[PDB]
Design a protein around this ligand. Sequence first.
Ligand SMILES: [Zn+2]
Ligand SMILES: [Zn+2]
Lengths: 374, 374
Amino acid sequence: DRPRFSFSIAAREGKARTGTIEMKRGVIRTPAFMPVGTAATVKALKPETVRATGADIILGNTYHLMLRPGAERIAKLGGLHSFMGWDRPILTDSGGYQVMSLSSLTKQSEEGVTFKSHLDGSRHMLSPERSIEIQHLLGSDIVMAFDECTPYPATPSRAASSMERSMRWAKRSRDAFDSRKEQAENAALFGIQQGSVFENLRQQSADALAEIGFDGYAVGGLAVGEGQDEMFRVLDFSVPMLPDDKPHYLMGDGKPDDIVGAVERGIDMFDCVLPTRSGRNGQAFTWDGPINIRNARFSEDLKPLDSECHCAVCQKWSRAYIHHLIRAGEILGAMLMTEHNIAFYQQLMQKIRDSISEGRFSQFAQDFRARYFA
Amino acid sequence: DRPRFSFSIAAREGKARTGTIEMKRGVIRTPAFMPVGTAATVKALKPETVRATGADIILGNTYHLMLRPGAERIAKLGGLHSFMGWDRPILTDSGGYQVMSLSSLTKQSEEGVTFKSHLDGSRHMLSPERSIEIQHLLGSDIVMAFDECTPYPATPSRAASSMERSMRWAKRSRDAFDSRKEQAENAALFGIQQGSVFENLRQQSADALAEIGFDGYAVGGLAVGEGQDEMFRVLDFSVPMLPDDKPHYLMGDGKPDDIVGAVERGIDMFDCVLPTRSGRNGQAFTWDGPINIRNARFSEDLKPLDSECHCAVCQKWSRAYIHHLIRAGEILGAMLMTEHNIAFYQQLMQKIRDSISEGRFSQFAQDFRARYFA
Ligand SMILES: [Zn+2]
Ligand SMILES: [Zn+2]
């Protein structure tokens, strides 16, 4: 019934857009938050719970999956969707970022990268061709081109070199994806803009990616230490360089205010790990800003994590109980914190979508920030 | 509507019985498996999931709760049921066993015991009066008398001394419970038979407890190293000493075959920790015996944990997936293993209840053992 891929914009306000991506496995409402699944699980949540929070799509980490349980093994078992029990779209990253951040003994070349697993020191390889193949074996719906990441800060020369290599690799990724009929006909492929903080390099990258042609365009290389002011400054000039009629995906971690500002700058998709990572460490998001539930001030607080949140956690349990669970190291604490935090991010996305649709997003952003930072 | 406490026996076969305990917060089907909640949580499960597995009642560990978050704190917050979100009956243990097993610097006397917390070395006290008070503060439905445990093996003299002290403490527990109107009118009190492996001491203990009078009678002091043959030998003579018309509660850990044999000997209630403890360590129960899901033989096994199990885990996920989760140390692995194992124990209890009701329990026990140990 549904097409391989169709992005439609229903409403706009300034640079912000709201709409839908239709794919074979489901519809994705945009702007979208895509919860992160590492090794075939969204931390401490059954897939049905992830869906109940409002997620339309989740991310799978290729690097983690190729190490454990293995890409070929997942294919033999019927693919990632079947394996983990999530039947809606899955976006897979290329594996490259985690190779840089997590792996050891990395050897980089124009062909790709060889590296040692951080788990057992076994040797592995990634390349544009192999990354696209692994994403095929997983049965990914949205496949990411394999690129070479640029650390922050980067000199103009190094940023240019890595961007140029990334563009050559974007073409190789495109060709690998297209040559595999089943993948080409059923999945989508996104390209990744590079260029660090440099406007000229960002423009060259956008031009190269548009010439190749992709179903969507990510902004890569941000959220890696430059800070919000600089990230926003780069997004100001970078997002307008990308094709307007395709989704714009900001890759990287983000707080609620990062998401709001990025949407104001034309971003349609987010993959923030913060709500799945920081939940078990005690951080809970609320409309009045984040709290750390471990703080002693919550030990006898009968209110829910957030006073307005519609999630199941906030309907049933108190701050006092969750404080106890997290302090005690109980698994249920991680379950409840993670469900609430992902649900909070999804409610943020719903408010963003509704406000853009109603032409009051700028007001929403101002009201959101005033209260969140009060 | 329902009474404070009413135990009714609907059917019998040999020493085995099936029936119901009616209490204000709900009906408990017997023979019953009562999943263990330590510090106000059944490991890795929301209360609704615990209920979905078939549990009618759960256990709360008094020792753990008095340390964290504290009994007075739980009372201030509205009681244990409200705190953790379980609205059905809760049985609380007295705290005594864990004082012996887990605490340090224990000082025992005829008055009670003082001890240091294993968490932070803070000093605490338990006595018949204080244990009953803590169970009141938690809002327990079934309160356990506070006793003095007897290690295995025990000399006849030491077993007699501890049994005699336990009987004096049973009277003190009875009086403390009765003097508190709200507790006496709404909760039930069980006494605990002691006497180690000695028939004469078990008889003296049963006589003392029956003279005092309780709503139910536990068999204490077993499942502590004597092994199944000896446990069954002691149950053979010990259970018939207890009043026939009240529930018989075996305190201690147990495998599926321990439960079946104990029911054959007249036990009505079980509190086995094994399914909540061993799940995250890899052990899954099946009708063909236990398996360890971490074993490499399961890495590509698409079958559910058990071929007949009706639990949600066995409807949705494969052995291969759960193998991966447990090997990877993922929280979802513990969630799924624990849900399946508790559900397996509940299905065992349902088959036991149905077979007794139908006068075919002896056949069920034989068939169960033949297959479980094949
Ligand atoms: Zn919530
Ligand atoms: Zn099952």
